[PDB]
Amino acid sequence: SRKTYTLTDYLKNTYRLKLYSLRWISDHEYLYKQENNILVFNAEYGNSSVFLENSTFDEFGHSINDYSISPDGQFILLEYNYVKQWRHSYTASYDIYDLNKRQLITEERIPNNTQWVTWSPVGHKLAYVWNNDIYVKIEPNLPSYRITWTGKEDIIYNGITDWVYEEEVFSAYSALWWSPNGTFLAYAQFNDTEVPLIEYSFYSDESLQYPKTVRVPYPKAGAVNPTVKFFVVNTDSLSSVTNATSIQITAPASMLIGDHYLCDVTWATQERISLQWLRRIQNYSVMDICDYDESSGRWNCLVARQHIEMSTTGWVGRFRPSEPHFTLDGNSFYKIISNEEGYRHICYFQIDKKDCTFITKGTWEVIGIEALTSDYLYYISNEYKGMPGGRNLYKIQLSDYTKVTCLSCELNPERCQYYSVSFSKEAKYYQLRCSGPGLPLYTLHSSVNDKGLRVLEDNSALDKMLQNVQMPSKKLDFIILNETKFWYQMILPPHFDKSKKYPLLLDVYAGPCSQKADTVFRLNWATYLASTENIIVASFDGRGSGYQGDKIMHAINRRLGTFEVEDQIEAARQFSKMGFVDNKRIAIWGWSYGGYVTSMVLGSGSGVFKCGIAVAPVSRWEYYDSVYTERYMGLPTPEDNLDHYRNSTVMSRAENFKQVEYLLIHGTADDNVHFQQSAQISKALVDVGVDFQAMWYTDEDHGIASSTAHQHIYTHMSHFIKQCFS
Amino acid sequence: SRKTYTLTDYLKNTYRLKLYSLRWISDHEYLYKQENNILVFNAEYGNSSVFLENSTFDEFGHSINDYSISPDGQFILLEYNYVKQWRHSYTASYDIYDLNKRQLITEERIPNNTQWVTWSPVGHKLAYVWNNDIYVKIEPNLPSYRITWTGKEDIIYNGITDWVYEEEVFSAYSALWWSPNGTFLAYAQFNDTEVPLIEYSFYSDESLQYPKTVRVPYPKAGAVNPTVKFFVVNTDSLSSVTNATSIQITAPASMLIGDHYLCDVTWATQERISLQWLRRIQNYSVMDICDYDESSGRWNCLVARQHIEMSTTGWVGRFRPSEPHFTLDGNSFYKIISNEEGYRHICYFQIDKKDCTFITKGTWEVIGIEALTSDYLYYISNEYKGMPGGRNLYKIQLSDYTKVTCLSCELNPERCQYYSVSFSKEAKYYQLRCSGPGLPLYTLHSSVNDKGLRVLEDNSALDKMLQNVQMPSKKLDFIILNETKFWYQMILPPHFDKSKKYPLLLDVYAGPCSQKADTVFRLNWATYLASTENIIVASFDGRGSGYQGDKIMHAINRRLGTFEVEDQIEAARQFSKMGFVDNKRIAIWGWSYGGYVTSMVLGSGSGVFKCGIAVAPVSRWEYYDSVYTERYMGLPTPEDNLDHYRNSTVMSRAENFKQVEYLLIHGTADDNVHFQQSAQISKALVDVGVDFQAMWYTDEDHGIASSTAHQHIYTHMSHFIKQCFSLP
Ligand SMILES: *[C@@H]1O[C@H](CO)[C@@H](O[C@@H]2O[C@H](CO)[C@@H](O[C@@H]3O[C@H](CO)[C@@H](O)[C@H](O)[C@@H]3O)[C@H](O)[C@H]2NC(C)=O)[C@H](O)[C@H]1NC(C)=O
Ligand SMILES: *[C@@H]1O[C@H](CO)[C@@H](O[C@@H]2O[C@H](CO)[C@@H](O[C@@H]3O[C@H](CO)[C@@H](O)[C@H](O)[C@@H]3O)[C@H](O)[C@H]2NC(C)=O)[C@H](O)[C@H]1NC(C)=O
Ligand SMILES: *[C@@H]1O[C@H](CO)[C@@H](O[C@H]2O[C@H](CO)[C@@H](O[C@H]3O[C@H](CO)[C@@H](O)[C@H](O)[C@@H]3O)[C@H](O)[C@H]2NC(C)=O)[C@H](O)[C@H]1NC(C)=O
Ligand SMILES: *[C@@H]1O[C@H](CO[C@@H]2O[C@@H](C)[C@@H](O)[C@@H](O)[C@@H]2O)[C@@H](O[C@H]2O[C@H](CO)[C@@H](O)[C@H](O)[C@H]2NC(C)=O)[C@H](O)[C@H]1NC(C)=O
Ligand SMILES: *[C@H]1O[C@H](CO[C@@H]2O[C@@H](C)[C@@H](O)[C@@H](O)[C@@H]2O)[C@@H](O[C@@H]2O[C@H](CO)[C@@H](O)[C@H](O)[C@H]2NC(C)=O)[C@H](O)[C@H]1NC(C)=O
Ligand SMILES: *[C@@H]1O[C@H](CO)[C@@H](O[C@@H]2O[C@H](CO)[C@@H](O)[C@H](O)[C@H]2NC(C)=O)[C@H](O)[C@H]1NC(C)=O
Ligand SMILES: *[C@@H]1O[C@H](CO)[C@@H](O[C@@H]2O[C@H](CO)[C@@H](O)[C@H](O)[C@H]2NC(C)=O)[C@H](O)[C@H]1NC(C)=O
Ligand SMILES: *[C@@H]1O[C@H](CO)[C@@H](O[C@@H]2O[C@H](CO)[C@@H](O)[C@H](O)[C@H]2NC(C)=O)[C@H](O)[C@H]1NC(C)=O
Ligand SMILES: *[C@H]1O[C@H](CO)[C@@H](O[C@@H]2O[C@H](CO)[C@@H](O)[C@H](O)[C@H]2NC(C)=O)[C@H](O)[C@H]1NC(C)=O
Ligand SMILES: *[C@H]1O[C@H](CO)[C@@H](O[C@H]2O[C@H](CO)[C@@H](O)[C@H](O)[C@H]2NC(C)=O)[C@H](O)[C@H]1NC(C)=O
Ligand SMILES: *[C@@H]1O[C@H](CO[C@@H]2O[C@@H](C)[C@@H](O)[C@@H](O)[C@@H]2O)[C@@H](O)[C@H](O)[C@H]1NC(C)=O
Ligand SMILES: *[C@@H]1O[C@H](CO)[C@@H](O)[C@H](O)[C@H]1NC(C)=O
Ligand SMILES: *[C@@H]1O[C@H](CO)[C@@H](O)[C@H](O)[C@H]1NC(C)=O
Ligand SMILES: *[C@@H]1O[C@H](CO)[C@@H](O)[C@H](O)[C@H]1NC(C)=O
Ligand SMILES: CC(C)[C@H](N)C(=O)N1CCCC1
Ligand SMILES: CC(C)[C@H](N)C(=O)N1CCCC1
Ligand SMILES: [Hg+2]
Ligand SMILES: [Hg+2]
Ligand SMILES: [Hg+2]
Ligand SMILES: [Hg+2]
């Protein structure tokens, strides 16, 4: 009947999920970057107008890949010469189009090679980084004010993060934050003077005669971390003769005793700012609440006004301490923190009360706080049906915590069990985004009465199209391991027959606070394997897994590469003894942390798996960056946790690879998990006389996402898997 | 009943070839290292006598990897802490043991990390290189004298070569030459200031947190080459001046006009040195003969004493200008040069007479000159039977070139057709080393009448073992293409049956002046593929191959990656016509230059090969070094030969790789054929969506000779080959 979902389909992306990306520009309108031009929509009625034609820039002379309109509506930042860097960062050329005079600004324009550009929240002000220094433009065409002069390549970063702050702590490239009305510009400074450098070769195009060596400050476990400083500058009080005067906010003293990190910065009001700090030992963090002193020009952070957040079972926050959400007057706030019982719920704070009040509770967790109004607190949780792989929008009455309403649960329970949301400026409206188990569904609503205004994108096209191909199904369920229940999912081949026996591929990640079992709808490699190759692709969340409380998550604290790997074995072990699983054909593969787990499992000696593929895996924790590693592993010193660091490497298990077919893959330009990791694995197998399969991808990074590489790695992996299974 | 030669046998070295390594200390004796006891032998009778006994260096705490006794026999240099570098260079620690008093010298020892050491050719003087500077010791226990101060890491090398000079010009690491007497010390100095650095990562042991970046000054095609200067210093003045001045010998003007290389330096007499030079365009070479001026204290090189050697069809010499061999008085010498017919023969030169006289025959070539006495001149050649893959020792009478005698041809014509030789200090005795087609045979002879004195090693031990195993055979014949014969080699499976069709693997190298078809007896991977997997392993020496004249060798001049490649394919066709080859199971593999040729063939689109393996191949000539590459390709510039440098890359044929199974292997620490080359090959196949097998070897260089790595690569290649042939 019909045809199946083939590898080509997946690689050639013949079945496209339609999206609806909007950007609210007020509490009543949003922008919708269509394909050619850009449109503005009226949330209330749905009518729209073109904001600016596509052709407006035909003879611009460059290809534009991003339009950033100032909150004014008077200017447009044009982004071109897009040269990607790490996960978030990138360099590019910029130009500003003045909408009033309908002309491109030609004087004092933004320097080529600019690292970052950001508009003030309200005006048309501009802060941008160039050569590691901050610059402010009060007017799009006027000269630029040098806010900082200490910028030095690979040494000092002003306004931007260094490799590790970008990937591990902020999860963003920018290191500057404007105050709500644009008066103040807060920023951080990173000194990487003593941070060791990671060096690897980049070959570039065939034409390059000599390979060049890329070197970037990257602290590995236990290495020397970059130090940081925080400053606040007044952007309404700068001359042009006198250099800008930035006031530094330091401490806390409890933090200054040893190494630490600047975790988060949030503006409570026009003159209050809160900064969360965390010790290198991500066990104890402090939040500071500083106020601007009018006739003093300094920022004071009164003690007693600070709040301490610590963990006795693990680390603070899922990956970092949570974002605080301040009330209108900035005198109180809400943030997600861990329960006494270890579950994540919303706590209510009083800037001067050392204790907060949980407004939500129960054995499920609040994913995130999405919107706050004097009226309600909007948030997402996996409380519905008690299934942690489901996400729904909720709103709790700030006057009566008893009046909690689920906004997405009942809209379409069959097709929707996983949501994300986007509120307008004042939360008058909100777009709901459903991504499973059925096809993605985008809808628009008004918060006054949770009226369902209209359907934005229903993927009706894709639906009609997919009903013509034998698509696989997905089963979410759980098993019980001595008391606790752990969820798992299984992509089942079309016309699945519980009577027949199918080979099984264990798709794993299992990093601390991860979830590979959910209700999201995906079109990926697994889809093809099941649809075309009739292979069952299963994923399992065991110890270390997230959104199920700290008892589960923190289970692997200071002990990576133990329970999560073992639970993965136990699971596959139970899957085989299920009847429809051919135990002679069970494989495993993972990418990144999942490459690590996969490699550790294959070298466990369980004998459960016939073959496995590891892509860009971690081989020994001392090779990964400090921030992420120390969080779960502590320091690699004999006084702390060195022993486990040494007992949890992949190479130590080399000898057990003798009983399995292993495929090791890794990009040569991986700036995240250095090629070093896989090179030490391959060398260890060679030392032990174990044969295996290998494949490197020159100049590819952790995502091995280049168009050609992508199709090539998935093609190679397919052969490997069906060769092992057939 | 009777087992075969297995991969494990090969990998574990079950069946070992015995050797007999000598070290002539005089004209009558030689030292033989018996692993625990090094004894001195008397060529005349066969005496023994321990020279340095079993337990003489215990309580040393350090293992000695090699020794080296001083010419006057009074001392012995103990080498330990060996740490390899490139093909010849290496670092090590040293200690000098005094024999005149069985004591171990502890005063003014030689520095650790010493890059190189050599005794004077007479007596007990020492000259070593440390931190790129030259040092000299008159007495082993006395403080040395520094002779150079310009030593600088990766920039200025004194007494030692840089990377390219070590691998492509001298084929030696050392760059200093004591005069025969030991009075003068000549050395070269290299300046690599402007030479680009090749850079790659070195991961080291697992305990290393951050990878290391090895960077070696290495000139790729057309890049900036190092510059050179030649100096000579008088070591007998060291104890009278304080800072002995190093006299420099420059020019020739015909060389100074552009980039050039110092090729060879050999002492003619007590105060006469000959220096060979070559332009970067390796078609013009010049030899200078300089004499010490006991009045000026300088060294002059009379122009009437200068010799020009230029080639019109290719480069000069096989891999470099020929080496000169002077007569006692240094007034005449012998060099190997190609005659007008294009064959390499020995011709006689008079230092002050521009034209030389050829003393050897015609259609075959002299491989090298081995010894020179007042009576005769000994040389090795492939004249016998007219087979270039054969090798024999001959001696020609100096007073009458019509009197030529083959000292090895007939010793054992059935078992020995490839010899190498090692004469004594005065050529009074000489050891013959037979390499095939039979088992290695080492014998000792006296020059008076050339009679065998005795057999030093007959491998009868190994012979006894190999008879109890189904060994494979070797067919060494030839084929004629375009009325000119090219020799081939075939390692046939036991009980070969011309009726039954056999799978075939083409073992290739095919580089400029090479020989893959010979008479040498080998115990390698091929012995396994034939003995056990019943696979015919063949080799073919087509255009570009050497020892058969410049007509054949220079065929691929400025055309690298052409005929050499097409011939290799034709040979496969020719082999198929023979009738005992399975057309649908023909594979091809090669390492180094063979990897390159192998890839080019795989990307040819001539559906003759099913699969192929390339170990550490060259992908595009602009990636290889200048000295080797330019010698055959000229400059990679639009004026010169750029067009072909680009027309001969492996990546330009990525597309065709869809019709063959490819396995690309390469070591990441390869300082010769950089990983970059295979990195660009993988990247190109990926760009065109062609699948292939791959394997990298962490921290392995061009040899991939690490004990464990070596086993791993051959195990990995074996699976690929038998899978491709559908055995197992
Ligand atoms: C090795 O070769 C390099 C060149 O490849 C030699 O270095 C060059 O030496 C000259 C003279 O010693 C330098 O010129 C001087 O520059 C200084 C500073 O600009 C100036 O004050 C002097 O008047 C003079 O012009 C030249 O800069 C330098 N080039 C480089 C790239 O370093 C070097 O001397 C050679 N070493 C040996 C031992 O032969
Ligand atoms: C033994 O003699 C050699 C050569 O005569 C000495 O080396 C020479 O030393 C000088 C100074 O150390 C080197 O540099 C010169 O320095 C001046 C100072 O400013 C500078 O203006 C000149 O341009 C020049 O660079 C000189 O290049 C160097 N020559 C050589 C061939 O190495 C050596 O120092 C003497 N050893 C002892 C222990 O006296
Ligand atoms: C960025 O961070 C640097 C250190 O992390 C600041 O600097 C300091 O560090 C250097 C060394 O890293 C100190 O010492 C220098 O001189 C001594 C003298 O021998 C050397 O031993 C040492 O290796 C250094 O060369 C400096 O003394 C120290 N402070 C100062 C003021 O020099 C650096 O100031 C900082 N930059 C910014 C903009 O914050
Ligand atoms: C969308 O159209 C809006 C006008 O639409 C009419 O009036 C509405 C109140 C409603 O009854 C609808 O059904 C009618 O067709 C228009 O609204 C207003 O906002 C603009 C400024 O943005 C203002 O200039 C205009 O006068 C207003 N109109 C009214 C009658 O209130 C709105 O501009 C438009 N939005 C877009 C993006 O096209
Ligand atoms: C950023 O650079 C571009 C391109 O010019 C660069 O700088 C030149 C000095 C030269 O080194 C080029 O190779 C560089 O690419 C500037 O755009 C102008 O583009 C025109 C058309 O190609 C060219 O003729 C001009 O030389 C370029 N610049 C100037 C000053 O003439 C662009 O102005 C630079 N951006 C900023 C804000 O300085
Ligand atoms: C703004 O402060 C910076 C501080 O560095 C000044 O810039 C430097 O000034 C010194 C003079 O002491 C110069 O030698 C440097 O070349 C300048 N550049 C840099 C990047 O350091 C600058 O002069 C100050 N501006 C004013 C108006 O005071
Ligand atoms: C943005 O907020 C700032 C800070 O609250 C406002 O600036 C202050 O304005 C008051 C009077 O309204 C002055 O007395 C202070 O001196 C200002 N503070 C500073 C540090 O300059 C500003 O008015 C707000 N902007 C708008 C448009 O309301
Ligand atoms: C946070 O973790 C640290 C250790 O990483 C705990 O402090 C002590 O650290 C030393 C050295 O590693 C250990 O020997 C102790 O067992 C740790 N605890 C104590 C009580 O000394 C620290 O206790 C942790 N913080 C919290 C709040 O649990
Ligand atoms: C061998 O070395 C030299 C090579 O000529 C011999 O010659 C002497 O060289 C020095 C210069 O270093 C001159 O001053 C002498 O005049 C040369 N000697 C004669 C006899 O002319 C040297 O004599 C020999 N040395 C040894 C140890 O044999
Ligand atoms: C050696 O080869 C070079 C090639 O580099 C020849 O040099 C150039 O000049 C010649 C004139 O004498 C031309 O005829 C060559 O074509 C030219 N070669 C190139 C590539 O530019 C040189 O002639 C040769 N020398 C001898 C003795 O044959
Ligand atoms: C070897 O023996 C020499 C003497 O050998 C004897 O005399 C000679 C003339 C022959 O007749 C021989 O057969 C006799 O055995 C010694 O002079 C010499 O030093 C010895 N050399 C060694 C290395 O032991
Ligand atoms: C309980 O389950 C955990 C998680 O799988 C497992 O590690 C353990 O062996 C079981 N028993 C005990 C006593 O922990
Ligand atoms: C070489 O090193 C050893 C120990 O590392 C030391 O004992 C010896 O003295 C050193 N030699 C010199 C000349 O410094
Ligand atoms: C004829 O020429 C050569 C010999 O010079 C021979 O090897 C080749 O096969 C023939 N020509 C071609 C185009 O191959
Ligand atoms: C998952 C993400 C937060 C993380 N920084 C990461 O890149 N991982 C790569 C494998 C080990 C850590
Ligand atoms: C063969 C040798 C003289 C040479 N240096 C070499 O390493 N080759 C490697 C393949 C291309 C050149
Ligand atoms: Hg943090
Ligand atoms: Hg998470
Ligand atoms: Hg040379
Ligand atoms: Hg040769």
Which three-class secondary structure string do you get for A623-648?
A: HCEHHHHHHHHCCCCCCCCHHHHHHC
CA dist list (Å): A372 to B215, B596, B598:
57, 66, 68
* CA B187 – CA B190 distance, rounded (Å): 10
Cα A325 versus chain centre, distance: 20
Beta-carbon pairs below 8 A across chains A and B: 123
What residues form DSSP beta bridges with B300? B291
Closest CA to B589 of B519, B660, B531, B659: B660
CA dist list (Å): A437 to A18, A491, A519:
15, 12, 5
DSSP letter for A391, please: B
- Whose tokens are 């787990």? That residue is A597
CA dist list (Å): A719 to A710, B692, B693:
15, 11, 11
Packing angle, helices A707-725 and B675-687, rounded to 10: 90
* CA A600 – CA A603 distance, rounded (Å): 5
Which overall architecture, per CATH, does domain B1-470 show? 8 Propeller (2.140)
DSSP letter for A152, please: B
CB of B233 within 6 A of ligand 11: the answer is no
Cβ proximity of A267 and A290 under 8 Å: no
CA dist list (Å): A200 to A197, A214, B25, B617:
10, 6, 49, 22
Question: With the C-alpha atoms ordered A586, A591, A594, A600, is the resulting torsion angle positive or negative?
Answer: positive
* CA A423 – CA A404 distance, rounded (Å): 18
What residues form DSSP beta bridges with B198? B216
Closest CA to A661 of A714, A585, A571, A597: A585
Instruction: Confirm or reject CATH 3.40.50.1820 for domain B471-728, answering yes or no.
Output: yes
Amino acid at A481: L
B203 closest CB neighbour out of A196, A679, A694: A679
Contacts of A675 in chain B (CB under 8 A): 201
- β-strands B693-697, B661-667: how paired? parallel
Start-to-end C-alpha separation, chain B: 20
Cβ proximity of A122 and A133 under 8 Å: no
CB of B618 within 6 A of ligand 1: the answer is no
Cβ proximity of B682 and A206 under 8 Å: no
Q: Determine whether A507 is exposed, middle or buried from the number of CB atoms within 10 Å of its CB (0-12, 13-18, 19+).
A: buried
What residues form DSSP beta bridges with A136? A127, A145
Q: CB distance B209–A698 less than 8 Å?
A: no
Token couple for A626 = 């400090």
Token couple for A446 = 């008004």
Residue B543 CA: nearest ligand 14 atom is 7
Residue A634 CA: nearest ligand 8 atom is 5
CA dist list (Å): A526 to A6, A203, A467, A501, A596:
11, 32, 18, 18, 19
Cβ proximity of A439 and A16 under 8 Å: no
- Whose tokens are 């706080």? That residue is A369
Q: For B447, what's the count of Cα atoms within 13 Å in the CB-facing half-sphere?
A: 24
* CA B387 – CA B405 distance, rounded (Å): 18
Task: Residue B583: count other Cβ atoms within 10 Å of its Cβ.
Answer: 13
Closest CA to B335 of B554, B513, B326, B373: B326
* Angle at the Cα of B606 from the Cα atoms of B601 and B612, rounded to 5 degrees: 40
CB of A715 within 6 A of ligand 3: the answer is no
Residue among A670, A671, A678, A682 flagged as catalytic: A670
* Angle at the Cα of A675 from the Cα atoms of A669 and A680, rounded to 5 degrees: 165
Minimal C-alpha gap between B94 and chain A (Å): 31
CA dihedral B713, B714, B719, B720 (to 10 degrees): 70
- In angstroms, what is the resolution? 2.5
Closest CA to A523 of A537, A508, A511: A537
What residues form DSSP beta bridges with A350? A332, A353
Exposure string (b/e) for A671-708, b if CB count within 10 Å is 16 or more? bbbbbbbbbbbbbbbbbbebbbbbbbbbbbbbebebee
Task: Residue B365: count other Cβ atoms within 10 Å of its Cβ.
Answer: 26
B332-338 sheet: strands from edge to edge: B325-326, B332-338, B344-350, B353-358
Cβ proximity of A20 and A457 under 8 Å: yes
Of all residues in chain A, what percent are helix, strand and coil, respectively (each to 5)?
20, 35, 45
Residue B242 Ramachandran class (φ > 0 left, ψ -120 to 50 alpha, else beta): left
Q: For B707, what's the count of Cα atoms within 13 Å in the CB-facing half-sphere?
A: 4
Phi, psi dihedral angles at A622 (to 5 degrees): -65, -10
CA dist list (Å): B128 to A625, B198, B267:
45, 27, 19
Q: For A303, what's the count of Cα atoms within 13 Å in the CB-facing half-sphere?
A: 5
Residue B717 Ramachandran class (φ > 0 left, ψ -120 to 50 alpha, else beta): alpha
CB of A300 within 6 A of ligand 6: the answer is no
Question: With the C-alpha atoms ordered B496, B501, B503, B508, is the resulting torsion angle positive or negative?
Answer: positive
Amino acid at B471: M
* CA A469 – CA A458 distance, rounded (Å): 19
Token couple for B343 = 């064959």
Closest CA to B461 of B31, B38, B19: B19
* CA A502 – CA A535 distance, rounded (Å): 6
Q: CB distance B697–A682 less than 8 Å?
A: yes
The CATH class for the domain spanning A17-459 reads mainly beta
CA of A152 to the centre of ligand 3 (A): 14
Token couple for B215 = 């960077």
- Strand, helix or coil for residue A678: helix
Residue A428 Ramachandran class (φ > 0 left, ψ -120 to 50 alpha, else beta): alpha
Annotation marks residue A592 as catalytic: yes
* CA B391 – CA B369 distance, rounded (Å): 13
- Whose tokens are 């019109």? That residue is B312
| Helices (H), ranges, B363-521 | 460-466
Token couple for A524 = 């990926």
DSSP letter for A322, please: P
Packing angle, helices A563-576 and A593-602, rounded to 10: 70
- β-strands B376-381, B366-372: how paired? antiparallel
Closest CA to B388 of B519, B575, B480, B483: B519
Closest CA to B673 of B601, B612, B605, B599: B599
A441-446 sheet: strands from edge to edge: A419-423, A429-434, A441-446, A451-457
* CA B697 – CA A683 distance, rounded (Å): 7
Q: Determine whether B482 is exposed, middle or buried from the number of CB atoms within 10 Å of its CB (0-12, 13-18, 19+).
A: exposed
Token couple for A497 = 């027959």
* CA B307 – CA B314 distance, rounded (Å): 19
Cβ proximity of B142 and B135 under 8 Å: no
Cβ proximity of B504 and B586 under 8 Å: yes
Residue among A162, A260, A702, A718 flagged as catalytic: A702
Q: CB distance A687–B708 less than 8 Å?
A: yes
CB of A144 within 6 A of ligand 7: the answer is no
Of B183, B241, B294, B329, best ligand 9 pocket probe by most atoms within 8 Å of the beta carbon? B183
- Strand, helix or coil for residue A502: strand
- β-strands A611-615, A581-591: how paired? parallel
Residue among A70, A179, A311, A592 flagged as catalytic: A592
Biggest CA-to-CA distance, chain B:
82
Cβ proximity of B375 and B398 under 8 Å: yes
| Helices (H), ranges, B447-581 | 460-466, 525-531, 550-553, 563-577
Q: CB distance A220–B200 less than 8 Å?
A: no
- The residues, any chain, with a CB within 8 Å of residue A441's CB and separated by 6 or more, are A412, A415, A416, A432, A433, A434, A455, A457, A458, A459
Q: Determine whether B12 is exposed, middle or buried from the number of CB atoms within 10 Å of its CB (0-12, 13-18, 19+).
A: exposed
CA of B672 to the centre of ligand 16 (A): 8
CB of B108 within 6 A of ligand 13: the answer is no
**Interface with chain B: mutation pick from A618, A681, A696, highest number of B CBs within 10 Å:** A696
Annotation marks residue A702 as catalytic: yes
* Angle at the Cα of B137 from the Cα atoms of B84 and B147, rounded to 5 degrees: 85
**Interface with chain A: mutation pick from B11, B197, B201, highest number of A CBs within 10 Å:** B201
B709 closest CB neighbour out of A623, A649, A686: A686
What residues form DSSP beta bridges with A612? A588, A662
What residues form DSSP beta bridges with A397? A376
Annotation marks residue B554 as catalytic: no
A53-60 CB contacts, 8 Å cutoff, 24+ apart: A57/A97, A60/A95
Task: Considering every ligand atom shown, identify the ligand nearest to the alpha carbon of residue B107 and give its number.
Answer: 13
Token couple for A265 = 């910065």
Cβ proximity of A380 and A421 under 8 Å: yes
Q: Name the residue ranges covered by the structural domains of chain A.
A: 1-13+468-726, 17-459
CA of B226 to the centre of ligand 1 (A): 14
Q: CB distance B699–A683 less than 8 Å?
A: yes
CA of B287 to the centre of ligand 19 (A): 11
Q: CB distance B649–A210 less than 8 Å?
A: no
Helices then strands, each counted (H, E), chain A: 12, 46
Instruction: Confirm or reject CATH 3.40.50.1820 for domain A1-13+468-726, answering yes or no.
Output: yes
* CA A353 – CA A331 distance, rounded (Å): 10
- The residues, any chain, with a CB within 8 Å of residue A639's CB and separated by 6 or more, are none
Cβ proximity of A337 and A355 under 8 Å: no
* CA B712 – CA B718 distance, rounded (Å): 10
Q: CB distance A676–B211 less than 8 Å?
A: yes
Closest CA to B366 of B338, B401, B404: B338
Q: CB distance B708–A691 less than 8 Å?
A: no
Closest CA to A77 of A55, A53, A99, A108: A99
Residue A15 Ramachandran class (φ > 0 left, ψ -120 to 50 alpha, else beta): beta
Packing angle, helices B563-577 and B593-602, rounded to 10: 70
**Interface with chain B: mutation pick from A214, A637, A646, A686, highest number of B CBs within 10 Å:** A686
* CA B74 – CA B72 distance, rounded (Å): 6
- Whose tokens are 């030079």? That residue is B277
* CA A536 – CA A490 distance, rounded (Å): 6
